[PDB]
CSV table of C-alpha atoms and ligand atoms in Angstrom, one decimal:
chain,number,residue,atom,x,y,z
A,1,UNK,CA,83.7,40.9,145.0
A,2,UNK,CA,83.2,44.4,143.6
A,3,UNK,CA,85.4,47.1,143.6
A,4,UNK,CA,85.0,51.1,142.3
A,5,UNK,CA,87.6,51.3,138.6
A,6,UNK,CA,89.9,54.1,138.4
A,7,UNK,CA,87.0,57.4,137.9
A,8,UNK,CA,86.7,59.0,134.9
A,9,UNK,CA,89.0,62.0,133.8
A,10,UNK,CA,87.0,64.8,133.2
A,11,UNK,CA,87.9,67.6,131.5
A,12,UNK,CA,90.2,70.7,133.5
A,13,UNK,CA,89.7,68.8,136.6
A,14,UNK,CA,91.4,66.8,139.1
A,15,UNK,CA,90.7,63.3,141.4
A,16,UNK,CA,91.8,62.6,144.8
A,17,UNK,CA,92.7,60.4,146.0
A,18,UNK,CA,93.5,58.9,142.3
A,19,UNK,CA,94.1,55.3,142.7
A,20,UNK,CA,93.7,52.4,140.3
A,21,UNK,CA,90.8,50.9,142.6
A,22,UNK,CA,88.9,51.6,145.0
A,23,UNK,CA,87.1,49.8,148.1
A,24,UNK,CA,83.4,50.5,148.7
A,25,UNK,CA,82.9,53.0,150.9
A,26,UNK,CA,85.8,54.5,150.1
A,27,UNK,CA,85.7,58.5,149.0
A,28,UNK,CA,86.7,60.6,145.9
A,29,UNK,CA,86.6,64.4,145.6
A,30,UNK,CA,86.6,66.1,141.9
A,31,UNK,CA,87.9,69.5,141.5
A,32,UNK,CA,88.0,72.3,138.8
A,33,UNK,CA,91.2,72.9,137.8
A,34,UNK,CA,92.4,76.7,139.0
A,35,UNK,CA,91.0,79.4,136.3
A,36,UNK,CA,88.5,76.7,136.0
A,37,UNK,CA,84.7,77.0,137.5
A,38,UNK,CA,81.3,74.7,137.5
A,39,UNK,CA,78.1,74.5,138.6
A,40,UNK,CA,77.4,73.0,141.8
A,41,UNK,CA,81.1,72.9,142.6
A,42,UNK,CA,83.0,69.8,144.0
A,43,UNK,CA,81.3,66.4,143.5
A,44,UNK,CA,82.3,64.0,146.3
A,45,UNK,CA,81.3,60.3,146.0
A,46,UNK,CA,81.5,57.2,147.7
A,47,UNK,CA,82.6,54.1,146.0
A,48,UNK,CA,79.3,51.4,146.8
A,49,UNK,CA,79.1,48.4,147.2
A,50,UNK,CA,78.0,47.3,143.2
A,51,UNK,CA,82.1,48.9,142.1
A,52,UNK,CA,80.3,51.6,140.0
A,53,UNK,CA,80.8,54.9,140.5
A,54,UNK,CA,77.6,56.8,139.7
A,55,UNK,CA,76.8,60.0,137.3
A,56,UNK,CA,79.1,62.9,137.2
A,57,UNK,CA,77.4,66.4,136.4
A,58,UNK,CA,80.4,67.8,136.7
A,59,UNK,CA,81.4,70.3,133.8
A,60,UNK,CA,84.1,72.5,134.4
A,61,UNK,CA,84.7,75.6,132.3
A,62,UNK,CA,87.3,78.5,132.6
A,63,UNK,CA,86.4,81.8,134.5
A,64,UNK,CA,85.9,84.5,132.5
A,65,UNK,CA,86.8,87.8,133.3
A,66,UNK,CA,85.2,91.6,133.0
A,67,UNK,CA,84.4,92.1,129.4
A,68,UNK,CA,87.4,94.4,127.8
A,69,UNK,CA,86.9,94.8,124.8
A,70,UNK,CA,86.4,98.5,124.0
A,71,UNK,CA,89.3,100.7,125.0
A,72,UNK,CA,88.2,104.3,124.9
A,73,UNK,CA,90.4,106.0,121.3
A,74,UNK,CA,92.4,102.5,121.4
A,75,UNK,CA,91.6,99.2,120.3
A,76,UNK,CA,92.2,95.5,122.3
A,77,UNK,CA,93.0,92.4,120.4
A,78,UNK,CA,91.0,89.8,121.7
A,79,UNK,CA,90.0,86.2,121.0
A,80,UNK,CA,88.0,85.3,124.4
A,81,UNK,CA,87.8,86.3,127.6
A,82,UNK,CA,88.7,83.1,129.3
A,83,UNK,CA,91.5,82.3,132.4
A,84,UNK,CA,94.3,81.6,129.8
A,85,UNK,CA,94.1,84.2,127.5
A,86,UNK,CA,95.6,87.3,126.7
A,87,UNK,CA,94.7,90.2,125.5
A,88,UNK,CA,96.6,93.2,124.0
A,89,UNK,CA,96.3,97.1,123.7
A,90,UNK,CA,96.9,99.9,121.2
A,91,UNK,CA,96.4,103.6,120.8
A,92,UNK,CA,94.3,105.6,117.9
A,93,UNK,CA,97.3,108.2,116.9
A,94,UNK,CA,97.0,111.4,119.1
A,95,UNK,CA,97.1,109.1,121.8
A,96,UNK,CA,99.3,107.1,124.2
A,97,UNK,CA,98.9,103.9,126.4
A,98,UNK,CA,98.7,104.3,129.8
A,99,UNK,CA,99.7,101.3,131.4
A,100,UNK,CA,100.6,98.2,130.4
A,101,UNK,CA,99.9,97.3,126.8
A,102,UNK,CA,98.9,93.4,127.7
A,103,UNK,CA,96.9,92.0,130.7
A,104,UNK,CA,96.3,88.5,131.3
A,105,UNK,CA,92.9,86.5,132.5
A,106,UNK,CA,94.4,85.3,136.4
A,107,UNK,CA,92.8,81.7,138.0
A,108,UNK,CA,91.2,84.5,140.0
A,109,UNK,CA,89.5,85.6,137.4
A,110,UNK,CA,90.6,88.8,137.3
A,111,UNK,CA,92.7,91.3,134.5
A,112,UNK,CA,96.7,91.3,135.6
A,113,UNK,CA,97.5,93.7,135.3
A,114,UNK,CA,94.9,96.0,135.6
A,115,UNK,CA,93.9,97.4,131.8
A,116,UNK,CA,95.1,100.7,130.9
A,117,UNK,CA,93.8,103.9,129.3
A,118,UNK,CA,94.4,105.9,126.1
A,119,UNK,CA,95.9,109.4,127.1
A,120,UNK,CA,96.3,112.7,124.4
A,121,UNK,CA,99.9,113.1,124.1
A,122,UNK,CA,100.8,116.8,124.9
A,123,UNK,CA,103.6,119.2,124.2
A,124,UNK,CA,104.8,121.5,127.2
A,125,UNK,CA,104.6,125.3,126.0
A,126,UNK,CA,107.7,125.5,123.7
A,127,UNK,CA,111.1,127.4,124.5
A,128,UNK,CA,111.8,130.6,122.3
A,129,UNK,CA,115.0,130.4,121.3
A,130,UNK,CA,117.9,133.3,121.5
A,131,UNK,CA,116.8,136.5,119.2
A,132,UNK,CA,113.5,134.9,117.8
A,133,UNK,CA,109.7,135.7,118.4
A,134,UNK,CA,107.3,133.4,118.0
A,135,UNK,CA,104.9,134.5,115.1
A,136,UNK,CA,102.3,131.8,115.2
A,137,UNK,CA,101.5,129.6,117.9
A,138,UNK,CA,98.2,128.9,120.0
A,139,UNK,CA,97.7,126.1,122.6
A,140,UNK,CA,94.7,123.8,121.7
A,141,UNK,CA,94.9,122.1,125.3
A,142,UNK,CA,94.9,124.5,128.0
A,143,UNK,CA,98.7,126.0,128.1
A,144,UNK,CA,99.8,122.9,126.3
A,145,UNK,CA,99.3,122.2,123.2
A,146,UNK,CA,98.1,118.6,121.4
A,147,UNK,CA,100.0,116.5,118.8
A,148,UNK,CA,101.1,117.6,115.6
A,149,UNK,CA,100.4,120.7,116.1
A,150,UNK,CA,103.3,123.1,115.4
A,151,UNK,CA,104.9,126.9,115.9
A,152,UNK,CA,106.7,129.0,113.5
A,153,UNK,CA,109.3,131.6,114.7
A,154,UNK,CA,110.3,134.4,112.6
A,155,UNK,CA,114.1,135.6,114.0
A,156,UNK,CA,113.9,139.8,114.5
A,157,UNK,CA,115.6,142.2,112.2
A,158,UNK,CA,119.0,141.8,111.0
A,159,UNK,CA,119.2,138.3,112.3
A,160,UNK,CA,119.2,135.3,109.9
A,161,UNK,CA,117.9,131.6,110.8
A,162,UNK,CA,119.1,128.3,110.6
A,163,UNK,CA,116.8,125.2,110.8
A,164,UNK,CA,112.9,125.1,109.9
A,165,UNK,CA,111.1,127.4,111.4
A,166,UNK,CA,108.6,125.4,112.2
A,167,UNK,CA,108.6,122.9,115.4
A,168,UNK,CA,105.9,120.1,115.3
A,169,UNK,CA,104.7,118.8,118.7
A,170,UNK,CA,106.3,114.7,118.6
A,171,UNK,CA,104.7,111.7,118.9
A,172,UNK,CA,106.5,111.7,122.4
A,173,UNK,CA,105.5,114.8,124.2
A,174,UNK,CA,108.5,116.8,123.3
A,175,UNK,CA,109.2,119.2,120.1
A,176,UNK,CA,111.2,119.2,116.6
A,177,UNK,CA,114.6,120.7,116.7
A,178,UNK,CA,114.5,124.6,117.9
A,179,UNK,CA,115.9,126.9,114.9
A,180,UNK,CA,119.5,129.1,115.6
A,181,UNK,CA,119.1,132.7,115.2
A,182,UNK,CA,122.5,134.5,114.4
A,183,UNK,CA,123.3,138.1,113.0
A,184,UNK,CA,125.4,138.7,110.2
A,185,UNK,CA,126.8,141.2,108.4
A,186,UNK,CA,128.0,141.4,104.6
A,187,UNK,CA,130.8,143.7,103.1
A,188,UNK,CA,129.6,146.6,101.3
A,189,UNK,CA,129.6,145.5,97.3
A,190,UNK,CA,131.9,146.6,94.5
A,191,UNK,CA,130.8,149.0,92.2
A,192,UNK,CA,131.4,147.9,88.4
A,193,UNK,CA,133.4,149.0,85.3
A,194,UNK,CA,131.2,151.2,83.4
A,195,UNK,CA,128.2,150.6,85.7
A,196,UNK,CA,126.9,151.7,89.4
A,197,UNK,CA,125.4,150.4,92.6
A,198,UNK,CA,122.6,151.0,95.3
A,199,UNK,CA,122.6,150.4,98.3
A,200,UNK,CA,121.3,151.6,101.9
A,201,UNK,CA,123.4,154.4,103.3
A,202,UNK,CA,124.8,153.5,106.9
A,203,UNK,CA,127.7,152.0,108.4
A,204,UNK,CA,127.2,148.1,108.5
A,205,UNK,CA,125.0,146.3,106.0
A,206,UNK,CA,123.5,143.2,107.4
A,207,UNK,CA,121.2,139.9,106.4
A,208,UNK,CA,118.2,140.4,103.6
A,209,UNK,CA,120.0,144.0,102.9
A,210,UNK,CA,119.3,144.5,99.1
A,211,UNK,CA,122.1,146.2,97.1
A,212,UNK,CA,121.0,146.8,93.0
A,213,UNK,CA,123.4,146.9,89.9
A,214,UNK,CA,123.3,149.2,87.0
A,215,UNK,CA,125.1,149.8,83.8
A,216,UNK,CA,126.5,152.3,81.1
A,217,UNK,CA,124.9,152.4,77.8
A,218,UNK,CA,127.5,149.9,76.0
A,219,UNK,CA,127.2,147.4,78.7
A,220,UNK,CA,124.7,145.2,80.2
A,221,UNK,CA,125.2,143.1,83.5
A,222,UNK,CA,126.6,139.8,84.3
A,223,UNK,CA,124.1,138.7,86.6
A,224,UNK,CA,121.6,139.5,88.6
A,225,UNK,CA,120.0,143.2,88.8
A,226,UNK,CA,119.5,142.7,92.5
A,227,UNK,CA,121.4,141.2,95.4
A,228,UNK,CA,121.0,140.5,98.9
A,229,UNK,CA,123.1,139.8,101.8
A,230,UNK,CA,122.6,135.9,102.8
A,231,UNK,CA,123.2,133.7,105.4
A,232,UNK,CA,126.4,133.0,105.3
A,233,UNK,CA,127.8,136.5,104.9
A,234,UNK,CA,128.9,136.9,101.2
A,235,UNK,CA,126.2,138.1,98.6
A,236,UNK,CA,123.7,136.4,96.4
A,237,UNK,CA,125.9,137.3,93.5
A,238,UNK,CA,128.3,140.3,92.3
A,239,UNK,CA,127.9,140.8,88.7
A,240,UNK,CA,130.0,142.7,86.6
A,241,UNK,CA,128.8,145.1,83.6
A,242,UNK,CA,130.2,143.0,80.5
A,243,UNK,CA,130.8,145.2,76.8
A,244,UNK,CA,128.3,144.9,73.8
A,245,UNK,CA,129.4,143.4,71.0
A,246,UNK,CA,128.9,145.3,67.6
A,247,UNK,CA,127.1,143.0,64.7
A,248,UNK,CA,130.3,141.6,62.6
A,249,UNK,CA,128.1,141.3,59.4
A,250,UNK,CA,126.1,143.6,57.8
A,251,UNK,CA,123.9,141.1,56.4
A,252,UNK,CA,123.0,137.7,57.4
A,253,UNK,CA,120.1,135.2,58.8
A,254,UNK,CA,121.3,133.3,61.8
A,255,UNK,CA,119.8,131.0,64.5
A,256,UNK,CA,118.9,133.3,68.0
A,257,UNK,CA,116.9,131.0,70.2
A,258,UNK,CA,116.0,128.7,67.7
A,259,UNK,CA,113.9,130.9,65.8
A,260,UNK,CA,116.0,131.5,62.3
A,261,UNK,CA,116.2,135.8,62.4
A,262,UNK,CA,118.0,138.2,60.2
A,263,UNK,CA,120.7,139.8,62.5
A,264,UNK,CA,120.9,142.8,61.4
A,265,UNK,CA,117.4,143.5,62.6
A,266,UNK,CA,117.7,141.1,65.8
A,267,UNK,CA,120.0,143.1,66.9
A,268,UNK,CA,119.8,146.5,65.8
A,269,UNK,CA,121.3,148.1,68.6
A,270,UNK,CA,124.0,145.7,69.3
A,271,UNK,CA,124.1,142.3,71.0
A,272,UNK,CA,124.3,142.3,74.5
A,273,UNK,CA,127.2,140.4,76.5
A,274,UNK,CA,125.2,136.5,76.4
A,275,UNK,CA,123.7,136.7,73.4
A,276,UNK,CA,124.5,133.6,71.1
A,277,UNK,CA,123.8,133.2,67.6
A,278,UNK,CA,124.2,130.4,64.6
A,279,UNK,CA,125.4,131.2,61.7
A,280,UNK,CA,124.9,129.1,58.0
A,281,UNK,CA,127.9,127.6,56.3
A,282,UNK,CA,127.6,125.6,53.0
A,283,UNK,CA,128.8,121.9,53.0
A,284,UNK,CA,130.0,121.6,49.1
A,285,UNK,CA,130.9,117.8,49.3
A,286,UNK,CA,127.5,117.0,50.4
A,287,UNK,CA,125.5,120.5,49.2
A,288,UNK,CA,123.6,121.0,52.1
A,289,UNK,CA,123.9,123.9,55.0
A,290,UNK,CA,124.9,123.3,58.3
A,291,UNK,CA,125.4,125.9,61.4
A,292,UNK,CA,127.8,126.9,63.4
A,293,UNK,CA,127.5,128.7,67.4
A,294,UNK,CA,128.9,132.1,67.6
A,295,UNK,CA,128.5,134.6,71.2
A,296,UNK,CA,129.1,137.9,72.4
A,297,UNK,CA,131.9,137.8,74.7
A,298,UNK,CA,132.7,141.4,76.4
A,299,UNK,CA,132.6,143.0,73.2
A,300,UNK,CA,134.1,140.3,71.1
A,301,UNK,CA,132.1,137.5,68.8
A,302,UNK,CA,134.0,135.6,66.4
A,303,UNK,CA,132.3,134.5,63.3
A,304,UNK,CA,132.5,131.0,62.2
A,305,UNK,CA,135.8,130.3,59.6
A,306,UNK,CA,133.3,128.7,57.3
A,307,UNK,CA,130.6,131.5,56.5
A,308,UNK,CA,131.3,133.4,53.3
A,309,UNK,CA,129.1,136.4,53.5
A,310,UNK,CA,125.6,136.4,52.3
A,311,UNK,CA,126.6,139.0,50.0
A,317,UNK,CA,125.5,130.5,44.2
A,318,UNK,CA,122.5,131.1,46.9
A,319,UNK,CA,123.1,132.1,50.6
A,320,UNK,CA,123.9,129.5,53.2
A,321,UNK,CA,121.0,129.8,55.1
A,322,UNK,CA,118.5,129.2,52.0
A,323,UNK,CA,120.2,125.6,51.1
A,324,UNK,CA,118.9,122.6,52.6
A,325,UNK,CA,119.9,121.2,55.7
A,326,UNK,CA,122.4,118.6,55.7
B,401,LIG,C1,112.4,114.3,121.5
B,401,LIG,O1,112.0,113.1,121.8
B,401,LIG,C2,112.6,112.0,121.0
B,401,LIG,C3,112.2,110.8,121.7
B,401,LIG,O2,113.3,109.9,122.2
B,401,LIG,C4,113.7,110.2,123.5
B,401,LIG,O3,115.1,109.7,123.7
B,401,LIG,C5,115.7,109.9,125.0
B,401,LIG,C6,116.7,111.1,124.8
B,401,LIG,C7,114.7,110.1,126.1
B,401,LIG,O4,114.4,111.4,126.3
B,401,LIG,C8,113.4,109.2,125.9
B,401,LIG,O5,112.5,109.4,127.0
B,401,LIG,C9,112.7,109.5,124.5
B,401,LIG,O6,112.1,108.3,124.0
B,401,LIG,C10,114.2,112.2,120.8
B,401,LIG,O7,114.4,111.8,119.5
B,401,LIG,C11,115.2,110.6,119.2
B,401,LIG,O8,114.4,109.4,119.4
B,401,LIG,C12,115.1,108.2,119.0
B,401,LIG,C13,114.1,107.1,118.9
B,401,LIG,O9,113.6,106.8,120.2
B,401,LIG,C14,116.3,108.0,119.9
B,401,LIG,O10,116.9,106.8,119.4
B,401,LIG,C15,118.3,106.5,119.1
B,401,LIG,O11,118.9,107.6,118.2
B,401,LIG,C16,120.3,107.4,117.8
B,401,LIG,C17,120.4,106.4,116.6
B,401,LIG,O12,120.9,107.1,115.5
B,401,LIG,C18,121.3,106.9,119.0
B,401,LIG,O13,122.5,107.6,119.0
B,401,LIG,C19,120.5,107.1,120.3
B,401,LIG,O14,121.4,106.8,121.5
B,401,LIG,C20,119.2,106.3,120.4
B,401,LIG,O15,119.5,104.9,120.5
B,401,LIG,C21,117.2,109.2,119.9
B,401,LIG,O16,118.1,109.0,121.0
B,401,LIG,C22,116.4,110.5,120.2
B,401,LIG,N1,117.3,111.6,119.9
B,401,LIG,C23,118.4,111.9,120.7
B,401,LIG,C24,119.2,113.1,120.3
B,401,LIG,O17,118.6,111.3,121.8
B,401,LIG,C25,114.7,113.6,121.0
B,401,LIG,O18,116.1,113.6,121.5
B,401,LIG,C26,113.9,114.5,121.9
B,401,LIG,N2,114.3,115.8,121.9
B,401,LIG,C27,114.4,116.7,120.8
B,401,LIG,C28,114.9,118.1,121.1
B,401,LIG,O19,114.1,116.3,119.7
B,402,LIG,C1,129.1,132.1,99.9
B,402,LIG,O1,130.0,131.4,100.8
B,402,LIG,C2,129.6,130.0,100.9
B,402,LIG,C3,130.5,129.4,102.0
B,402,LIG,O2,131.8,129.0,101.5
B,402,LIG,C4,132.7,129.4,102.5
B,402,LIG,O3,132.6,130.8,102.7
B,402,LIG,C5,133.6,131.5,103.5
B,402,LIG,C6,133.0,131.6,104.9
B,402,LIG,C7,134.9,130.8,103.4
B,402,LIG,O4,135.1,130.0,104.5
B,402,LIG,C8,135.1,130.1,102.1
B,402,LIG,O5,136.4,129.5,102.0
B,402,LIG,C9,134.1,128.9,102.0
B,402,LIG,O6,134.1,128.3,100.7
B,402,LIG,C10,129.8,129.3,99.5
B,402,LIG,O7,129.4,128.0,99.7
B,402,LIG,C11,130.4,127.1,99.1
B,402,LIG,O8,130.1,126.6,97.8
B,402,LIG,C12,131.0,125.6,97.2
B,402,LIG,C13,130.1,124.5,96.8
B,402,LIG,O9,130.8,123.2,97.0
B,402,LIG,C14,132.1,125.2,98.2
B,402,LIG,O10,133.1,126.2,98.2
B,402,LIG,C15,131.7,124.9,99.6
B,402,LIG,O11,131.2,123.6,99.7
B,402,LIG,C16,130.5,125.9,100.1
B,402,LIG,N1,130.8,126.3,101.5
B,402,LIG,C17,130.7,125.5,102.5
B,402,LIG,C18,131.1,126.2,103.8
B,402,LIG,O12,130.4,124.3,102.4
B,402,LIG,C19,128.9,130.0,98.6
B,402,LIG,O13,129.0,129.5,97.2
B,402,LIG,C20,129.1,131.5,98.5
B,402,LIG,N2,128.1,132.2,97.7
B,402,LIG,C21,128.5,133.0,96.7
B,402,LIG,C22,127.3,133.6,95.9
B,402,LIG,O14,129.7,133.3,96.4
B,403,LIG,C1,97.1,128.3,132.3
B,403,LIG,O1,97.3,129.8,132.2
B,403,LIG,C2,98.2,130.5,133.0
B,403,LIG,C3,99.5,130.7,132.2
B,403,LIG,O2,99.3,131.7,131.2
B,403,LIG,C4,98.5,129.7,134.3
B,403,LIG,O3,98.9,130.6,135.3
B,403,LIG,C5,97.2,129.0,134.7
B,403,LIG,O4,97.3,128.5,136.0
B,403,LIG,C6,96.8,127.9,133.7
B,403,LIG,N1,95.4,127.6,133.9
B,403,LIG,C7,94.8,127.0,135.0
B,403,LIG,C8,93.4,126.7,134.9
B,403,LIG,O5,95.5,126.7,135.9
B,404,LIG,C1,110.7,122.6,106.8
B,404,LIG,O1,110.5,123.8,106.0
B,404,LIG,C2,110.3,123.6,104.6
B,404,LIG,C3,110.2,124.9,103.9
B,404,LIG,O2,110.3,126.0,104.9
B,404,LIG,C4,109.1,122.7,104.4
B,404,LIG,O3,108.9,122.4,103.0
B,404,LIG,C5,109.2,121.4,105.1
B,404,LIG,O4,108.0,120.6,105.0
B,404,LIG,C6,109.5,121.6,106.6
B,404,LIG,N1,109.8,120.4,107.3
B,404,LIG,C7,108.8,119.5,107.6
B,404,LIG,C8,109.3,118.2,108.3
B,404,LIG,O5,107.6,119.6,107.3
């Protein structure tokens, strides 16, 4: 009495009928699993009369689907190209995925969904915002223009922007923020005590407008010689003219800039309104020099308590304490 043993499991496939034994004569059919494919297809067999089932050249392997693997300025991460597997898209920067950035290997055998493509990104031809011109800008893709690439307005006369200037095309296919482009208008400026001021003659002064400063022979300026009206409506500065200070010694070497100079020749012709100076003093516990700051201040300077004219030896020939 012989009778056929449960078959064999075979790898990715299935039996049926499955059962624990079989009678001879009795019938099996084997059958890839889905995704899975082999040569010759099905095996049926018959269980005989000896109870053993016979050879099974059955070898199933998984389908494989259309080779992917290049994706035109992109690139697909891959292990196989089998039924289970997945593979997975990306764009070389410039350009953006069009469609679906995975797809799967199907039973069928086929890419779900279907692979995408690598598109340029492009900007529409960009808006010109409110009292601007657009100095520099060409298209490099037809009317539209590719990524990164930029424009630059420069805002008409008398008008003053806010924002960069430039807009960059995006990584989306839109652009930067657009620049505001306002007028504005600045007071006329004060003329100085014992100085003048220049300035264009007509009614309303506006943005970039340069006024320039000037002053009388004692006096020098505050500030800047130049001004201009900014942004925000006020000037770049207003500088006063400031008095000249007379030397307060008649002899003496002092510290101007760090360079030890005799003052009286330093400044021959006065010092002007921010000139500082240091002047010696002798410290007679220790018997060393030491200094002592000392500026022009709208035709005052004080010199130090400490300094007994140059007129022992002078202050500024001791050593340093
Ligand atoms: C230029 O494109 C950019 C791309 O984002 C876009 O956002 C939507 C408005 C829509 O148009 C969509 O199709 C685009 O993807 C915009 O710049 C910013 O992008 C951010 C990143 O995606 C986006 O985000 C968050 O930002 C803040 C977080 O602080 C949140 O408040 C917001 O609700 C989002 O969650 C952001 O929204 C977006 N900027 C704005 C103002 O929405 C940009 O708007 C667009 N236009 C310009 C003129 O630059
Ligand atoms: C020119 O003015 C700006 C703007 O300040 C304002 O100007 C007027 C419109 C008016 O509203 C004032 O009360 C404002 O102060 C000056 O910028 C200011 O600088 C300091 C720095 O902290 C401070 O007062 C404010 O933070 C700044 N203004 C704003 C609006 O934030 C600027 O200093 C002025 N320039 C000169 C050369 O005076
Ligand atoms: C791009 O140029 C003009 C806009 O200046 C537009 O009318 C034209 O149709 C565009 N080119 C083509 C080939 O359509
Ligand atoms: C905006 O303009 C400034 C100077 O005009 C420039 O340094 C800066 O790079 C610009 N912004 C960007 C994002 O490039």
């Amino acid at each position: 009495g012989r009778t056929c043993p449960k078959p064999d499991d075979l790898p990715f496939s299935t039996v049926v009928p499955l059962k624990t034994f079989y009678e001879p004569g009795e019938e099996i059919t084997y059958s890839c699993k889905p995704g899975y494919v082999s040569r010759g297809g099905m095996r049926k067999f018959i269980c005989p009369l000896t109870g053993l089932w016979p050879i099974n050249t059955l070898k199933c392997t998984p389908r494989v689907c259309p080779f992917a693997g290049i994706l035109e300025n992109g690139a697909v991460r891959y292990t196989t190209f089998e039924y289970p597997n997945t593979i997975s898209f990306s764009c070389n920067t410039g350009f953006y995925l069009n469609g679906a950035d995975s797809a799967k290997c199907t039973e069928e055998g086929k890419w779900s969904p279907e692979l995408p493509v690598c598109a340029p990104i492009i900007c529409p031809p960009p808006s010109i915002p409110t009292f601007a011109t657009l100095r520099v800008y060409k298209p490099s893709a037809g009317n539209n223009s590719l990524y990164r690439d930029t424009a630059v307005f420069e805002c008409l006369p008398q008008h003053a922007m806010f924002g960069n200037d430039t807009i960059t095309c995006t990584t989306h296919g839109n652009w930067t923020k657009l620049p505001e482009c306002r007028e504005v208008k600045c007071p006329f400026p004060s003329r100085p005590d014992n100085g003048f001021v220049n300035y264009p003659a007509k009614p309303t002064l506006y943005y970039k407008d340069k006024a320039t400063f000037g002053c009388h022979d004692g006096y020098s300026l505050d500030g800047p010689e130049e001004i201009e009206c900014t942004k925000l409506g006020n000037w770049s500065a207003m500088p006063s003219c400031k008095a000249s200070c007379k030397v307060p010694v008649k002899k003496a070497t002092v510290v101007y800039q760090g360079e030890r100079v005799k003052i009286q020749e330093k400044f021959k012709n006065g010092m002007l309104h921010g000139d500082k100076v240091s002047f010696f003093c002798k410290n007679k516990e220790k018997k060393c020099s030491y200094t002592e700051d000392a500026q022009c201040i709208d035709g005052t300077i004080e010199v130090p308590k400490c300094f007994k004219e140059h007129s022992k030896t002078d202050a500024s020939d001791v050593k340093p304490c």
